[PDB]
From a paper:
In mammals, the cleavage and polyadenylation specificity factor (CPSF) constitutes the core of the 3′ end processing machinery onto which the remaining factors, including cleavage stimulation factor (CstF) and poly(A) polymerase (PAP), assemble. These interactions are mediated by Fip1, a CPSF subunit characterized by high degree of intrinsic disorder. Here, we report two crystal structures revealing the interactions of human Fip1 (hFip1) with CPSF30 and CstF77. Taken together, these results provide a structural basis for the multivalent scaffolding and regulatory functions of hFip1 in 3′ end processing.
To shed light on the hFip1–CstF77 interaction, we subsequently reconstituted a complex comprising the hFip11–35 fragment with a truncated construct of the CstF77 HAT domain (residues 241–549) and determined its X-ray crystallographic structure at a resolution of 2.7 Å. The structure reveals that hFip1 binds to a conserved positively charged patch located on the convex surface of the CstF77 HAT domain arch. Within the hFip11–35 fragment, only the evolutionarily conserved residues 20–27 were ordered, adopting an alpha-helical conformation. Interaction of hFip11–35 with CstF77 involves salt-bridge contacts of Glu22hFip1 and Glu23hFip1 with Arg402CstF77, and hydrophobic contacts involving Leu26hFip1 and Tyr27hFip1 with Phe398CstF77, Val428CstF77, Ile432CstF77, and Leu435CstF77. Additionally, the Tyr27hFip1 side chain interacts with Arg395CstF77 via π–π stacking. Corroborating these structural observations, simultaneous substitutions of Glu22hFip1 and Glu23hFip1, or Trp25hFip1, Leu26hFip1 and Tyr27hFip1 with alanine disrupted the hFip11–35–CstF7721–549 interaction in a pull-down experiment, whereas alanine substitution of Trp25hFip1 alone did not have an effect. In turn, mutation of the positively charged interaction surface in CstF77 (Arg395, Arg402, and Lys431 mutated to alanines) abolished the interaction with hFip11–35. Our crystal structure of the hFip1–CstF77 subcomplex reveals that a hFip1 binds via conserved motif within the N-terminal ‘acidic’ region to the convex arch of the CstF77 HAT domain on both protomers in the CstF77 homodimer, resulting in a 2:2 stoichiometry. By reanalysis of previously reported cryo-EM data, we reveal that this interaction mode is preserved in the context of the mPSF–CstF complex. In the presence of excess CstF77, PAP binding was considerably reduced, indicating that CstF77 competes with PAP for binding to hFip1.
Author numbering:
A (entry chain C): 19 to 27
B (entry chain A): 244 to 548
The structure:
Amino acid sequence: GDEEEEWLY
Amino acid sequence: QEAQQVDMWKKYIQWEKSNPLRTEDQTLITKRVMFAYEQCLLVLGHHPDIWYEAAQYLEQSSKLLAEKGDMNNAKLFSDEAANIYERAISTLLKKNMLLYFAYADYEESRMKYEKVHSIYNRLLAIEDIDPTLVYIQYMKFARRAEGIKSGRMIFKKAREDTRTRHHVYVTAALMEYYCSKDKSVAFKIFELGLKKYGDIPEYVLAYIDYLSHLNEDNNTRVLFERVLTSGSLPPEKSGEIWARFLAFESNIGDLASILKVEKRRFTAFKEEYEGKETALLVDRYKFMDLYPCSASELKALGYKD
């Protein structure tokens, strides 16, 4: 979710 | 056969394009050329090159009419080229990735991005299609025409599609390194991809390749050890990885590190490399197209590749 996307960028 | 018919038709079309009548009206030459294209496509509509070349010819004509200032016929032939793409993917070749992409690039070149989004998503909606390359091209368009953030969204959409294969991860990572010049994001994407596809030799080799060229010895060795010791890469699918490791040590290491790595490799393939120690030694010295042995010596050694 927004967690993987936050970790990436 | 069919190849003869295609060649006949293309030669007829080329003749018409040569303006044998020496008309000065480009609209008339274009009408005649497109007529020949139509007759051809009636019976060879399953050949994607004919659609593409016909659309390209119409676009070229549109540009020539624009240079001469005839904006009305230019706009007309521009829209008709778009319709050529639309007809091509609407019948016969409804699943031809190449024409979908060509269409997308044409509408991108006309600055009609909404139509580009529709085209890529139409293709993506066909269930029995491998969408990986589709996502790669879509991300390329998003990044170069709408910016990093649109690209990251397309990448998100790709990860959420269970049909997508590992290449998009590679692409996204390389994009972040090559376009945003951001090594940290590149790393994180490669690492997420590694969690998901660490058992795929082509993926692991892509990450290895990226990191090696960063030219930091310790990080490269660490990644080599991670992948070859832990991880999911089958031991029988790891030969190329060991090869890259031996080349890394040959470039930055000494003879001792090379021999350590060589022996670990042989252990890992003790069975497959029985009696092939000398054929392996060849690869300690080879560089580009220079070999330490003649072709006949190499064949007698059991040398491969």
